[PDB]
Amino acid sequence: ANHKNFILMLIILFLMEFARGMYILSYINFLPTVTSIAVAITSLAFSIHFIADASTNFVIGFLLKKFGTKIVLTTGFILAFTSLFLVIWFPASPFVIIFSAMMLGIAVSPIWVIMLSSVEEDKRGKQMGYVYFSWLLGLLVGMVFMNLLIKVHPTRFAFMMSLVVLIAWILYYFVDVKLTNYNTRPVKAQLRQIVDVTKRHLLLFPGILLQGAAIAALVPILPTYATKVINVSTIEYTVAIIIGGIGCAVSMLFLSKLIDNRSRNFMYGVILSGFILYMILIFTLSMIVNIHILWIIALAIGLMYGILLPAWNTFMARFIKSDEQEETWGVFNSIQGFGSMIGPLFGGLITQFTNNLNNTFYFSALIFLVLAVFYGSY
Numbered sequence: 065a066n067h068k069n070f071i072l073m074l075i076i077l078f079l080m081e082f083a084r085g086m087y088i089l090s091y092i093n094f095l096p097t098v099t100s101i102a103v104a105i106t107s108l109a110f111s112i113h114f115i116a117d118a119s120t121n122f123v124i125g126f127l128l129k130k131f132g133t134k135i136v137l138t139t140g141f142i143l144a145f146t147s148l149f150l151v152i153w154f155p156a157s158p159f160v161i162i163f164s165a166m167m168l169g170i171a172v173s174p175i176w177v178i179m180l181s182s183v184e185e186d187k188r189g190k191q192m193g194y195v196y197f198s199w200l201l202g203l204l205v206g207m208v209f210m211n212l213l214i215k216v217h218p219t220r221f222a223f224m225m226s227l228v229v230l231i232a233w234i235l236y237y238f239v240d241v242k243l244t245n246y247n248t249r250p251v252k253a254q255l256r257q258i259v260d261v262t263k264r265h266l267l268l269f270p271g272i273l274l275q276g277a278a279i280a281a282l283v284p285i286l287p288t289y290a291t292k293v294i295n296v297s298t299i300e301y302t303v304a305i306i307i308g309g310i311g312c313a314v315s316m317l318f319l320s321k322l323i324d325n326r327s328r329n330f331m332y333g334v335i336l337s338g339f340i341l342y343m344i345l346i347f348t349l350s351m352i353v354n355i356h357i358l359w360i361i362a363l364a365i366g367l368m369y370g371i372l373l374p375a376w377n378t379f380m381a382r383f384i385k386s387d388e389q390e391e392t393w394g395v396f397n398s399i400q401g402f403g404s405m406i407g408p409l410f411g412g413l414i415t416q417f418t419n420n421l422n423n424t425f426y427f428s429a430l431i432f433l434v435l436a437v438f439y440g441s442y
Contacts, residue, residue, distance in 0.1 A: 065240055070183035072239045074194055077179050078202035079232030080172055085206020086148060086225030087165045088113060090214070098218040099156040109165035111405065116169035118401030124174050125181075125394020126259055130248040133241045136174050141233040144171030148226040155219040171229075177397060181389040182242035186381055189327025192374040197320035243390060258388055262395050267384060270436055272396055275376065276403025278429050279369075281411035285422055294355055304355045308362040315366025323374045331379045332441040338372040339437065343430035350423050383440075 085091070092109055095101040128136050147164035154160045184191035206225065213221040290305055326334075345364050348357075384392050411422045 066183050066185070066242075069239050069242065070191065070194075072235060073175070073179050073183055073242070074198050076232050076236050076239070077175055077195060078198040079228055079235070080144075080175050081199050081202025082206035082209070082228045083144065083148065083168060083225050083232075084172075084203045085208070085210040086222070087151070087161075087168045089203070089207035090210030091151070091222065091225065092161065092165060094210075094214050094218060095156070095161065098214075101156060101158050101161065105158050105162065109162040112162060113165035113169035114401060114405050116166045117173050118398050118405060120170045121173045121177065121401065122259075122391065122395040122398035124170075125177050125391030125397075126255055128174060128178060128243065129258065129388065129390040130250065130255060131245070133243045133245040135245075137178065137236060137241070138233075140171035140174045141229065141236065143167045145226070145229045145233065148222075148229060152222045152226045155222060173394070173397065177390065177394045178242050180377065181393040184381070186378075187324070188378055188381070189324025189374065190321075191324075192377045193320050193323035193370075196370070196373050197316065200316060258391060262388065262392060265385075267380070267392075267396070268436075268440065269399055270432075271376075271440075272399045273403035273406070274429060274432070276400045276405070277407035277410060278403075278426060279407065280404040281407035281426070282422060284408050285411060285415065285419065288419070289350060292350070293353060293358065300355055304358070308358040311359045312362035312366035315363050316370035319367065319370030319374070323371060326371075327375060327378060330441075331375050331382065334375055335372065335379055336433075336437040336441070338368050338375070339430060339433045342368045342372075343427060343433075346423050346426050346430075350420060379440075 088110060092106045095106050096103045124136065144167065147167035150160040150164050179195055180192060184195075206228075210221075210225060213224060290302075293305065294301065296302075342365060345361050345368070349361060349365075353361075380396060386392075411425060414421050414425050
């Protein structure tokens with residue numbers, strides 16, 4: 065019932081991203097202010113959350129490829145709900161904080177790979193658009209929600225993101241599973257062999273890890289760039305930065321709906337075209353700016369994001385080898401998240417000399433992109 069279950073999974077994913085209004089963007093970020101928890105420990109639980117996801121991705125792809133289907137989503141539901149249940153009773157203990165971020169980081173991965181390894185039809189210029197839109201939506205709306213909760217009381221309302229996973233799991237029980245565990249007679253001779261043959265295959269690993277290293281290398285450093293955006297004005301400054309965020313978000317909001325409205329035949333040209341386009345816009349970004357220049361450049365950078373991510377995913381799927389999709393996707397997500405963590409870690413060390421070297425580092429990433437795009441299109 066794949067279209068009825070593409071809906072269900074679309075909601076389940078969204079609801080699971082709502083649980084990143086807990087142990088990542090909002091609730092972890094708040095602990096030091098109200099408690100004696102270290103200003104750094106929340107910064108560590110954040111990353112041990114993301115290394116947990118990025119690491120667990122590729123192994124879980126196989127762990128569903130033959131070992132199971134319904135239970136691996138069920139075990140993820142259990143460990144996520146229980147690790148979030150740890151905070152509702154033990155809020156300020158640092159160990160529960162760093163642990164549940166590790167565990168909530170595990171559970172999201174199976175839902176992600178089963179989400180993009182199955183319910184999309186590979187005529188999925190819209191599907192991954194709906195998936196990525198719902199992902200961004202649940203992620204940001206959860207964080208805003210938990211901001212609204214701490215402003216009532218900080219740590220009290222921790223059952224709420226603890227129970228969103230409960231409704232997402234109850235909703236999951238209505239989904240027919242998106243693969244069959246059947247009988248895994250080749251328990252290991254195929255398991256290990258596929259983890260080997262897929263690892264050994266570089267299905268454009270330079271594409272994926274560098275894509276993660278580029279997308280994430282600027283977001284932490286961008287708010288410090290707000291100081292250099294323009295001479296501050298009483299009404300035309302920070303509110304203008306808010307408008308730059310607004311017109312950029314609408315871009316990705318625009319690209320929930322019309323990504324398969326513009327995804328037919330060869331995608332190879334639009335990928336490189338978006339690459340050079342955000343090259344030009346990053347060159348136009350920090351270097352020269354006016355107050356309204358950011359708004360159109362933000363709308364353009366968001367259109368590039370919301371058109372590139374689904375189109376890069378559909379491009380991979382159009383040239384991934386198939387009948388191993390449960391893990392063929394998990395390895396991609398592992399490398400993509402590991403690049404997404406190495407990105408900010410590399411931009412912040414490249415900025416040890418000057419903050420403007422981050423954008424020229426992105427320009428060099430684009431120049432190597434010009435080298436590697438010639439290989440994927442002939």
